Design an enzyme around this catalytic site. Structure first.
Site, short mmCIF file in Angstrom:
data_model
loop_
_atom_site.label_atom_id
_atom_site.label_comp_id
_atom_site.label_asym_id
_atom_site.label_seq_id
_atom_site.Cartn_x
_atom_site.Cartn_y
_atom_site.Cartn_z
N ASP B 305 0.82 -1.22 0.00
CA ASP B 305 0.00 0.00 0.00
C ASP B 305 0.86 1.29 0.00
O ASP B 305 1.57 1.53 -0.98
CB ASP B 305 -1.05 -0.03 1.13
CG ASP B 305 -2.01 -1.24 1.05
OD1 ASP B 305 -1.91 -2.10 0.14
OD2 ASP B 305 -2.89 -1.35 1.94
C1 LIG Z 1 1.20 -6.00 -0.53
C2 LIG Z 1 0.34 -4.98 -1.19
O1 LIG Z 1 0.77 -3.86 -1.40
N1 LIG Z 1 -0.89 -5.40 -1.51
C3 LIG Z 1 -1.89 -4.61 -2.19
C4 LIG Z 1 -3.29 -4.82 -1.62
O2 LIG Z 1 -3.42 -4.25 -0.33
C5 LIG Z 1 -4.33 -4.18 -2.53
O3 LIG Z 1 -5.60 -4.56 -2.04
C6 LIG Z 1 -4.13 -4.64 -3.99
C7 LIG Z 1 -5.05 -3.94 -4.99
O4 LIG Z 1 -4.92 -4.57 -6.26
O5 LIG Z 1 -2.80 -4.40 -4.41
C8 LIG Z 1 -1.85 -5.09 -3.65
O6 LIG Z 1 -2.15 -6.47 -3.69
#
Ligand SMILES: CC(=O)N[C@@H]1[C@@H](O)[C@H](O)[C@@H](CO)O[C@@H]1O
Ligand SMILES: CC(=O)N[C@@H]1[C@@H](O)[C@H](O)[C@@H](CO)O[C@@H]1O
Ligand SMILES: [Mg+2]
Lengths: 731, 746
Positions: B305
């Site tokens: 995130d």
């Molecule tokens: C580890 C990370 O950054 N995960 C994010 C997740 O929180 C989000 O919901 C998603 C949206 O496509 O992208 C990534 O999977």
């Protein structure tokens, strides 16, 4: 059924020569009829050339890349070349005429930094960088005529004397050749047609240390240099050619390469020289009361049968090797001769137990669909006539073919069928390489070329008018107003797509404007491609055809595929197994997923052979129509672009099915759907030739089966046919 | 057996919470009363740049921003109008009208690459349209414009995905602006006082969201898990110019439409921006940590995130004083992303599946995915331990699947037991392997990723290299071309891998026309190094007509680019029996058909020696078309369909290996492992601490006098383990099992 057929001579079988010539309506005998004699201006006189050995043809050779492991490196000259064919030229000053290149940097090594060993064909390089690769480009004498050499190795002629070739660029050899031909003419009163096979410069054809083909280009002019010519070139063009300008970093100026000015300069130079001498040979021939006929192949380099001026040579004929539709067209479309001839297959040579009628009827099928579009005057075969008189099923095959041939002539008057569209192939070469795009070895498409060669072969026998244009034509004069469709195809960075010409905004403006106003553009493989010019746009005309190629620069942008349209005019003749279609429908389309785009079919629809894949093609927007987009990428698509249309095809190996696909693409893209039906066959395996000025049409089976088809005439009515093995019907 | 396990919880669930915490050996509890009595560590999620519409709606020019590129619009005359917003999600993105478009935006003739004169275009007062005049007809035009980000990309994603339909869109904020920054810090100070019961602040995450833009159809339009798009503002752009001595063009962000994909060969402007943003992000993360620590709490960062600018693999990360990083365990590779991070006291995995109705629904069996996820993570964990594990989502949801519940007890127990036996020490690596690309260490385990844990058609043939290595019995480091050019190749390195398509960060692009790079690698291989090239290694377009892979001589293979079609290619006979392919399942029907059909006879312009029928048996993923051996002394191991998939070559003391692609599988990981031992001339070293069966792996702990063997599948596996002294033991491993044995203690 009179004449138009050429029959090869035999050692003594002079009995069936009268009977087979009568059965086949033959009027000419190869080697009280017309007599052909093959002439070979640059070989067959070892008594001359052994006394003047520096007058053999020469060629720049590139050695293997040698790794240096300190500041010196030894580079053997001849380790990868056939020493029987090629020998390093030690007469012409190596430091003047050769070049050592550091391939790692691209820099020419200074001549103070290298020497030719006195006793070995090895170059000693000093003062260089460790861990770079080094090559030598050196001149070599060709001490064995490449084609005669080929026949020697193929037939295993054992220790038979090797024909040494000579180069008429040297005044002494030139004088010898003309003197000899003069005498030959005087000593040849029975000969009617001098069959030049061919002239002065062999197409690039070099062999390796294991007696294999090493380098071949049917259009190549590797084998055309000598110190005198290189110095004269400098005097005439005002700069000095590097050896690099012939070895081309290992590519040897393959016709697939985007042509450089140096190559064009050399072609012009060679061509002035070849043409003046060919004319001299034709004049002498004519003065003696004989016709002059050129073989399209072997020592044909520098003649340029498709360049302007060729007619001024005053040759009576071109004769050529027929392997297929495309190679038939190469011969048939040649302007500025009185007639043309195809040497049909099979050659009369033991390796063709077997039913020889099959090859003969087949070779005739690929050729006849082309002859319909662009007729050739004469036909014939080469070789041993005794070896084929033995095969009674085949002799009757020929009688039929000779008569069909003349019947065609007698019905049509050598007039070409009517073309229902005007199609232009657009590439770096244009007209000068008419029907010669994608060829490496004559008649031998391979894994790497066949997906593009299929385009020419499809067009070769199609009911449209095909012309060949260059990027120079389009930039100087725009797009001729009578063209309906332009085709651009090939891989990126080739002569056939065009390379960086596509970054020239004038070119893009011209095509875009022409399509917007109602033109049609068909891109095959990697059309309009320019690497690195735009980060997000590989195919520069992606917007026209609705398809681009992902080049790993845009992975962050999700690609969304619209649903594929399975019932469409373009694909209307593709049979799909219902169970294949069912599976494809059932599995459906991918659901958008982060980083993965969406809408790609989970299972393939199939049905079509597209040849080599172009990986990661994708639709530029969701208004592009996808016709095949199997395996997560795009094979077939169509896009509306103002009044006009663009179409993408990833590849197109030749087949009846694929020829029909292309034909449908051509009528669709130029908004001519309603013009398609007239003079069409419902069966893709069959093809129609319409001859309006004679009030006739014919329909042909492209195969040795029975084929059932419905022909649609221009007035709306339909006529059914049941065609026997490679049949022909006339109405 | 208790601890190292984080438990999710909710309101009105104190009893099940208590029971499951006891069942699983949970020592920590994640928020989402009465539960607080248990004496567990308490985690609370914190979201620095959102969850406060009451502030940001009063300060809307302080939302984060991003440069956006419009569609290409065709001019058909000397004027053209460009809609700014027709390809974008208007609920997420809004053109920035406050900041002078003529200062901050660019109109570009994409057909020439030229910037359109600022005098020749105007922004319509009433519509989101740019008007341009004095242009060339038949050229394509775009606008690069700044847009406010009015909906939080991740909250938005979740809203759309979960059909929240109704609830207020949360609006993100950008702490680069002093006012917003003060709000954030005053608010964190206040929260800390209002949360005496919290032990661990779980920042989810910090200040800048990774590139995540949506289109006018509410689909993802642009994603990059490492992307810096959502990090600009007029102020920040202006400060950058002052600091670095040059102005970033909007082009330096939109990147012609690439948006600075990690796959793009990095430009200086990209690196400067990261350094700029990172200074600012890091200073502020540190303050949060310091405030946390002063409140008596730990600070834990989610690897995901809003993590842009934290740069966990860049030097200095340890100076933030963060206690922990937590991340999503998606596979081996994503496990290693988390585990190898230096600069924190401990690391934590959040395992799958997430406790949500998309997988916890009647008829589904989440225990299969739960154990699968454990299997994939455990093979990586043996190579690089993570300290803690846990789950997220709704406990009341998982509580209804007793089979799943019992699977967790097993995993929790197994996780803790691996920790107690190994003391949290990494297994012994048998070779030193270096992955070489443009990024190096700062993108450790991050090569080939676009969206996190989502390999696709375009990436899986290369992502497979990382997934293979993630749990392999070797030491893996990531090094850059800059490292190599500055200091040469570290002497402890056995193997260098260079992998990817041409013109990407991962192969390296034009760096391969740098003589020094070529010199360094060649000399090192010749002196006994091993070079493994995958896809289009060392590739440089156009530089040499006859040489596409610059190191073709090392690996014995190059790719035909239609420049060399006049040169016949001659393939030597394939060698089906080789160390490298020793563990490939034989198909005697394939092998005999292959043998029968034999090799192509030399044909004019077609070369010769290509097998007429495929040998097969190995999945190489995406084809690299028209690869061929450079000479007949190269060893072809697979060369099906008139091109090369697998080959080896001797290069002085050392060796090179070509592989066209490598999707992850047990078989392919084993093939890679064998490539690494072979290429380093370490065949004799291969046996020690190995599993005969490719579905199992061996981890050796010399200093605990232990080894274990693990079953990577859900099927039983029998395998024979070879020890260092040459002795062997046989194992019958159950479904997903582990076995431990004593070895000689060092
Ligand atoms: C580890 C990370 O950054 N995960 C994010 C997740 O929180 C989000 O919901 C998603 C949206 O496509 O992208 C990534 O999977
Ligand atoms: C038309 C033409 O140039 N034919 C030649 C043929 O003479 C020669 O034997 C062969 C060598 O491989 O090359 C070409 O096929
Ligand atoms: Mg000596």
């Amino acid at each position: 059924s009179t004449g138009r057929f050429t029959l090869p001579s035999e050692e003594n079988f002079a009995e069936k020569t009268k009977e087979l010539a009568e059965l086949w309506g033959a009027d000419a005998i190869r080697n009280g009829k017309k007599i052909y004699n093959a002439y070979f201006p640059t070989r067959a006189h070892n008594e001359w050339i052994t006394l003047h050995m520096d007058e053999t043809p020469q060629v720049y050779l590139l050695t293997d890349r040698i790794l240096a492991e300190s500041d010196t490196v030894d580079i053997p000259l001849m380790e990868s070349f056939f020493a029987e064919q090629l020998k390093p030229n030690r007469d012409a000053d190596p430091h003047k005429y050769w070049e050592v290149v550091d391939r790692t940097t691209g820099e020419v090594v200074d001549s103070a930094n290298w020497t030719l060993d006195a006793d070995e064909d090895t170059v000693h390089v000093s003062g260089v960088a460790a861990w770079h690769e080094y090559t030598v480009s050196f001149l070599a004498y060709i001490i064995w005529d490449p084609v005669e050499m080929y026949n020697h190795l193929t037939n295993d002629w054992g220790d038979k004397e090797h024909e040494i070739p000579f180069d008429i660029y040297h005044p002494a050899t030139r004088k010898f050749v003309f003197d000899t031909f003069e005498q030959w003419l005087k000593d040849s009163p029975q000969t009617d047609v001098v069959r030049f096979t061919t002239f002065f410069y062999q197409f690039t054809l070099l062999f390796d240390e294991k007696r294999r083909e090493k380098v071949v280009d049917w259009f190549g002019c590797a084998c055309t240099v000598s110190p005198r010519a290189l110095d004269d070139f400098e005097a005439k063009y005002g700069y000095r050619l590097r050896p690099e300008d012939f070895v081309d970093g290992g590519a040897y100026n393959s016709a697939w390469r985007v042509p450089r000015k140096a190559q064009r300069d050399w072609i012009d130079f060679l061509s002035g020289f070849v043409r003046e001498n060919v004319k001299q040979l034709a004049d002498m021939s004519h003065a003696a009361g004989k016709e002059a006929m050129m073989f399209l192949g072997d020592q044909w380099i520098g003649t340029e049968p498709y360049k302007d001026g060729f007619d001024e040579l005053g040759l009576d004929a071109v004769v050529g090797s027929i392997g297929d539709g495309t190679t038939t067209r190469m011969i048939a479309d040649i302007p500025g001769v009185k007639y043309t001839e195809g040497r049909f297959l099979p050659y009369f040579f033991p390796d063709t137990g077997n039913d020889p009628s099959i090859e003969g009827l087949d070779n005739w099928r690929k050729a006849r669909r082309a002859i319909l579009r662009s007729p050739i005057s004469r036909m014939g075969y080469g070789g041993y006539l005794s070896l084929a008189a033995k095969f009674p099923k085949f002799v009757d095959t020929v009688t039929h073919i000779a008569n069909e041939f003349r019947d065609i002539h007698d019905r049509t008057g050598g007039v070409a069928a009517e073309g229902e569209l005007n199609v232009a192939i657009l590439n770096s070469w244009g007209k000068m390489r008419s029907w010669m795009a994608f060829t490496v070895a004559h008649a031998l498409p391979n894994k790497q070329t066949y997906s593009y060669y299929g385009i020419l072969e499809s067009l070769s026998g199609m009911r449209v008018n095909v012309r060949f244009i260059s990027f120079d034509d389009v930039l100087a004069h725009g797009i001729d107003s009578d063209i309906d469709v332009i085709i651009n195809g090939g891989p990126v960075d080739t002569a056939f797509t065009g390379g960086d010409v596509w970054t020239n905004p004038k070119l893009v403006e011209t095509v875009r404007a022409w399509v917007r106003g109602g033109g049609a553009f068909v891109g095959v493989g990697e059309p309009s491609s320019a690497p690195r010019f735009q980060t997000g746009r590989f195919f520069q005309l992606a917007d026209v055809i609705g398809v681009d190629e992902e080049r790993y620069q845009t992975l962050s942008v999700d690609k969304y595929f619209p649903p594929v349209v399975p019932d469409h005019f373009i694909t209307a003749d593709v049979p799909v197994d219902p169970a294949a279609r069912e599976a494809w429908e059932q599995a459906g389309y991918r659901i958008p997923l982060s980083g993965c785009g969406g809408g790609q079919s989970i299972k393939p629809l199939g049905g079509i052979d597209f040849g080599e894949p172009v990986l990661n093609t994708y639709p530029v927007n969701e208004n592009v129509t996808l016709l095949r987009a199997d395996g997560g990428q795009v094979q077939l698509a169509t896009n509306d672009y103002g009044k006009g249309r663009g179409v993408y095809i990833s590849g197109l190996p030749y087949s009846a099915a694929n020829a029909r696909l292309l034909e449908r693409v051509l009528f669709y893209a130029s908004h001519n759907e309603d013009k398609y039906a007239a003079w069409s066959s419902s069966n893709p395996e069959c093809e129609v030739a319409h001859f309006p000025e004679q009030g006739l049409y014919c329909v042909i089976n492209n195969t040795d089966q029975p084929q059932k088809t419905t022909v649609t005439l221009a007035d709306g009515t339909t006529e059914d046919f049941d065609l026997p093995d490679s049949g022909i019907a006339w109405r």
